[PDB]
Amino acid sequence: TYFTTDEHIQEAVVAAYDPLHWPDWAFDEYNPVNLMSDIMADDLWVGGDSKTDNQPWHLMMNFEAIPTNMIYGLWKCAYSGVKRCNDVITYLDWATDVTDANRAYYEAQVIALRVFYYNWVWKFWGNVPYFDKNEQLTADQLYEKMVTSLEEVIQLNVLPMREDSENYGRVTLAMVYMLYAEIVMYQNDDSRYSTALKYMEEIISSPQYDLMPDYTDIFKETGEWSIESIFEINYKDDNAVRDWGSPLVAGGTALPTLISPYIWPNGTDNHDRGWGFCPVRKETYERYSNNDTRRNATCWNAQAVLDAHNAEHPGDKLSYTTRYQDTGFFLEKYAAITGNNKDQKSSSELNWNNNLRIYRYSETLLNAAELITRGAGQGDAKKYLNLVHKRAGLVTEIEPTLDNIIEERHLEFVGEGKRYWDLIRTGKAASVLVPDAYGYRTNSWSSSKKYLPIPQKEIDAAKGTLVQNNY
Ligand code: NA
């Protein structure tokens, strides 16, 4: 009865977006979607009390995940998203008073969201259940369903290129273009490279997408939905009431609590404390040139801050509590900043206002450079690469080789859930992700590690329906 009117179907479309903001704290797990890939690359450690604190993260990082000790929150969030998208398509088949223009717009949002949620399970697990109404496909078969759905959304021709202040967070054409380029490039689907390049060029031609001149302004609260932002997942502290017992409410994010220094003295250098997950590797700080603005915007030297403080006051000496894999560096982009939870009305730990940046225009420029270099089309790959390189303060221009473009991504997107997928899709993962001199990673990546083990509870529930990955 209820989901028969346009007004109520709009409420269902809004509901289909909610699982976007769940995985950082949902289904009694912390599975923040960016960190779940970055812990498997070469930029961060895992941290916590020990290798048994969030053990599933430590196992994934060392390519020894097991089905009975695996992340499961993200899986449940992805399929909750898929189910809510399917509900809207079902409701539209039984719709009283929905105009043709509105039907197509509602459809464009939920089909694009559905591909976005399938992309989470496609990337992490590959060979997973598929449904468009409320069965295990191969990764290659799921790619086929995903890319065809994006083609249909693009062909509806109803999404705006950019949203306005009232609706930031809604699906846009630019968001769909970026998701299209993402899955096309991860699949190595050279048949679609020229189309993906044409889409990147359309975003580049828009005067309403560009680089922020100062990379240090991006991850500030004032940098949310800037000229650089193509897509973010919205989080707020203002009267936010996300809680241990209320993880699903539209509130703040847990991410800053997870990755800020344990028992930091709150307010020192306008940073707050967290649980000491995902310290930034010393090697990440060292790979930057001194005049690369990304170095300090990525790597916050918490220990140097206290060393300075203690020199300037030998009376009032401070420390934080170093945890497993401590380096003295934390991920500045999503660090707990004094004031960024100040208006929350529940658990301070779960209500940070930091939006999760998904697609930034520097990714558009690097995607276009790489696609041009791979022979998708003619275009100024060198200009596109160096707009990003030079925005970071670097004076030397670099040639648009594949290695140079892949390394610029590496410098550009630490902690943003890009590097692991870039290593795998370019064939670099086997040679880069090898045992370290710390004894932290003790295994080498190999092609069997591309798809994680499916959770044992899902294998058990499918009654032989779900074939476990050979990981
Ligand atoms: Na532009």
Q: Which CATH number characterizes residue 106's domain?
A: 1.25.40.390
Do 392 and 215 contact (CB within 8 A), yes or no?
yes
DSSP code for 455: P
Evaluate whether residue 240 is within a structural domain: no
Ligand 1 geometric centre to CA of 209 (Å): 4
Evaluate whether residue 249 is within a structural domain: no
Evaluate whether residue 265 is within a structural domain: yes
Ligand 1 geometric centre to CA of 458 (Å): 44
Point out which residues pair with 330 in neighbouring strands. 300
Residue 283 and residue 464: Cα distance in Å, rounded? 44
User: What is the domain range of residue 284?
Assistant: 255-354
Resolution given for this structure, in angstroms: 1.8
Residues 6+ away with beta carbon under 8 Å from 416: 34, 38, 333, 357, 360
The residue out of 329, 354, 379 marking a domain boundary is: 354
DSSP code for 174: H
Long-range contacts of 201-205 (CB under 8 A, 24+ apart): 201/368, 201/379, 202/161, 202/173, 202/177, 203/161, 203/174, 203/177, 203/178, 203/230, 203/361, 203/364, 204/364, 204/365, 204/368, 204/384
- For residue 347, the number of C-alpha atoms closer than 13 Å in the C-beta half-sphere is 15
Q: Are residues 136 and 283 both part of a single domain? A: no
The structural domain count of the chain equals: 2
Q: Are residues 336 and 370 both part of a single domain? A: no
Query: Please, what sign has the CA dihedral across residues 160, 419, 233, 360?
Result: negative
Which one, of 158, 270, 159, lies nearest residue 221 by Cα? Answer: 270
Give the residue carrying structure tokens 């043709």: 100
Do 93 and 106 contact (CB within 8 A), yes or no?
no
Evaluate whether residue 248 is within a structural domain: no
Ligand 1 geometric centre to CA of 200 (Å): 10
Do 189 and 147 contact (CB within 8 A), yes or no?
yes
Which one, of 157, 198, 250, 151, lies nearest residue 378 by Cα? Answer: 198
Q: Are residues 259 and 216 both part of a single domain? A: no
Chain centre distance of CA 95? 35
Which one, of 312, 260, 255, lies nearest residue 25 by Cα? Answer: 255
Do 369 and 376 contact (CB within 8 A), yes or no?
no
Ligand 1 geometric centre to CA of 378 (Å): 18
* Lookup: tokens for 207: 């005067």
Element (H, E) at 139: helix 139-156
Rg (CA), the chain: 22
Q: Are residues 306 and 399 both part of a single domain? A: no
Do 228 and 210 contact (CB within 8 A), yes or no?
yes
Evaluate whether residue 85 is within a structural domain: yes
Ligand 1 geometric centre to CA of 354 (Å): 25
Ligand 1 geometric centre to CA of 143 (Å): 29
The residue out of 301, 319, 354 marking a domain boundary is: 354
Ligand 1 geometric centre to CA of 359 (Å): 14
Residue 104 and residue 135: Cα distance in Å, rounded? 27
Q: Are residues 297 and 324 both part of a single domain? A: yes
Do 253 and 352 contact (CB within 8 A), yes or no?
yes
Evaluate whether residue 241 is within a structural domain: no
Chain centre distance of CA 203? 20
Q: Are residues 350 and 415 both part of a single domain? A: no
Evaluate whether residue 269 is within a structural domain: yes
Evaluate whether residue 181 is within a structural domain: yes
Residue 200 and residue 207: Cα distance in Å, rounded? 13
Ligand 1 geometric centre to CA of 167 (Å): 20
Chain centre distance of CA 152? 24
Ligand 1 geometric centre to CA of 162 (Å): 12
Q: Are residues 25 and 108 both part of a single domain? A: yes
Q: Are residues 67 and 85 both part of a single domain? A: yes
Ligand 1 geometric centre to CA of 204 (Å): 4
Element (H, E) at 357: strand 356-360
Residues 6+ away with beta carbon under 8 Å from 356: 21, 24, 32, 33, 34, 232, 233, 235, 253, 255
Q: Are residues 383 and 347 both part of a single domain? A: no
Q: Are residues 66 and 205 both part of a single domain? A: yes
Q: Are residues 341 and 402 both part of a single domain? A: no
Residue 452: C-alpha distances to residues 56, 61, 104, 251 (Å)? 11, 11, 36, 30
Ligand 1 geometric centre to CA of 361 (Å): 8
Which method resolved this structure?
X-ray
Ligand 1 geometric centre to CA of 183 (Å): 22
The residue out of 336, 354, 372 marking a domain boundary is: 354
Ligand 1 geometric centre to CA of 240 (Å): 34
Length of the chain: 471
Ligand 1 geometric centre to CA of 449 (Å): 37
* Lookup: tokens for 262: 């344990």
